[PDB]
Design a protein around this ligand. Sequence first.
Ligand SMILES: *Cc1c(COP(=O)(O)O)cnc(C)c1O
Ligand SMILES: *Cc1c(COP(=O)(O)O)cnc(C)c1O
Lengths: 365, 364
Amino acid sequence: MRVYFDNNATTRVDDRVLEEMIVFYREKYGNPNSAHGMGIEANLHMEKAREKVAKVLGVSPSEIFFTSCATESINWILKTVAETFEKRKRTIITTPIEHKAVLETMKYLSMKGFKVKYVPVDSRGVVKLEELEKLVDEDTFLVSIMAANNEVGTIQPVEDVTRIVKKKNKETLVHVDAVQTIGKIPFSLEKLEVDYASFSAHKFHGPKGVGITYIRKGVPIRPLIHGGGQERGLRSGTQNVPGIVGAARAMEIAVEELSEAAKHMEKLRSKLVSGLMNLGAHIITPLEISLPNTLSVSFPNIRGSTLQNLLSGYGIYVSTRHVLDAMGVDRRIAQGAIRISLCKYNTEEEVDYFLKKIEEILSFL
Amino acid sequence: MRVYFDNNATTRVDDRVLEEMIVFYREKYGNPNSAHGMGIEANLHMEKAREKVAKVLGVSPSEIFFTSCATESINWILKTVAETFEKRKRTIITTPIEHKAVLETMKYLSMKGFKVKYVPVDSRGVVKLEELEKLVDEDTFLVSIMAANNEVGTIQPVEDVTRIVKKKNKETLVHVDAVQTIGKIPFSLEKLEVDYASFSAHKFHGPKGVGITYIRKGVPIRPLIHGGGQERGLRSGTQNVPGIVGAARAMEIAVEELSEAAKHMEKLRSKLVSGLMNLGAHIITPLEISLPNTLSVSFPNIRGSTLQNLLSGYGIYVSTHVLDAMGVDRRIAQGAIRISLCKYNTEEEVDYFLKKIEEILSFL
Ligand SMILES: *Cc1c(COP(=O)(O)O)cnc(C)c1O
Ligand SMILES: *Cc1c(COP(=O)(O)O)cnc(C)c1O
């Protein structure tokens, strides 16, 4: 049996999404910027996708931008916003549990002369709100937080972070890496009061090669990619129409089936939690404040990679750092840590299979 | 019938290409950076794609990088190469007929304090070699030239350009926007001696959302996209595996059938040229030094947009600074439409095009 439990790394495209995408590869393949009939037709569907994404997120179509991935969206926002504040402001705040897309960009901005401060997180991986309040100063133009951690699944208090940041400095902008939200926990930007947000379609059964960016009307931004003038002149290059259409459909389906999908994942996760603890596993993920499909565990007596390799040999796929370290997790636990991440298509039969095979693997070791 | 003559704007994905892509959406959907079996499988196919592209272009697999589009590649190269020369060198040279991906990036680098020089082109759209030799100096760290113009089709003397540039300053790097080459004219980087080149899969029956970048082993480059470490740490973000696999297969097919395709397109283009000239059309495209599929024509006293609009109504798709750089008269420019064929266009479509465009000219 093939058991894919690494959905936080990427997901299989939904059959409904793929079907819609094929139309744009085979029939409506026009360039959305062309003034002719096939061009206007492509542009129509691209705009319909943008509107569908805006509706799901609760924002205006004009605030939705398409990129090649969330990593691009993140580089774009962090780097161009910084660029608009050069000579004026110099302080940026984020957390040490952010994805490398954010961290490596912050590392780059540091080299360029910016001051990046890191708000620590507690042992459950939740940002320390009291330390955040202190770190935010008048020279702070941007705060970048994630809606949920990809490795351990810890959900962050975005609303409190936004409220606390605005009270300490009304002008500070907030960016939310919202990649792990869609289809796992509810996420609307309608009343969230953030300025920028990043999403990746392949994390919610959408295709790879497509990122989604929310940029609040009027906030700072410049092009990371200059050229033909696509995306209101802010991100040039021919738009990945098939991808954009699939991604929008994927987002809509993910949010529409959220309630049922979340209950189901939460249920499969509880079966995994108990079955693994009974085999000697330490649970790293804080179950009460985490994505319902995510479960980071550890068998301290075994290297995570060794466990990962053996599971893969049995047709079971899981994944295997800077996050656990920031959480104060013991090095021995971190060394044997593996991440199990479900999707709406995972079943109880796969969980039973996973528990049975992992027990065998463990007895041989 | 439906006649798509706007292949230089984008093309329909080859059925053979799409068939391969579908496998990566449905079955082999692992993250190529994942350490497990599905990750290894995706990484494997992604590396095969890289090798297939390297083989086609005559370079090493380690010199091939995948992006989201040629525009991203162009931004990546121009912006980060310039970044490495900050406070050292400050002059960049390009032409006025370059695609906006290049011109807009130059406009940005100019605003950032770099000195951008523009080598003029002749009335046929060919870069003036004498002026190039003159403009390149010791402060010139990079020269960006296109292999062929997308609007009028003019093929540029890339070898001469590189040769002239190296003799004047052996340290100057050369980037070639090679987007309009693949599947239209032969293009190998094996003995070309350039440092960077950009390609766009959707211009050769590959998917949209995929760019191919050639970076000579050892030349300057920094990440435009920082993050997880993908593409040798030079371009992060989860790689578009289905697209990469599709783009490589498309490139392989395009080049493998270039000989037959280019002759077929040239035959179709000549029939179009004669038919259009026998209707009063001025031919803006230099037939002697241009892509075999491209034809920029203009009817006196008829706006290109109007002509394009009517052609579209008849199920015929064509498109409407390059002309300004070539010295083309305003009136002729305003009437310009661009016809661009692909290997799948037919003689039947050309006849239909000629018959309907005449009918249209009578109503206008
Ligand atoms: C996957 C992920 C990213 C990066 O997505 P790419 O699609 O690879 O660009 C960024 N942030 C988080 C939280 C992620 O899970
Ligand atoms: C189409 C084109 C580009 C841009 O390609 P995108 O895929 O839209 O990034 C760049 N240069 C030339 C010559 C082109 O024809």
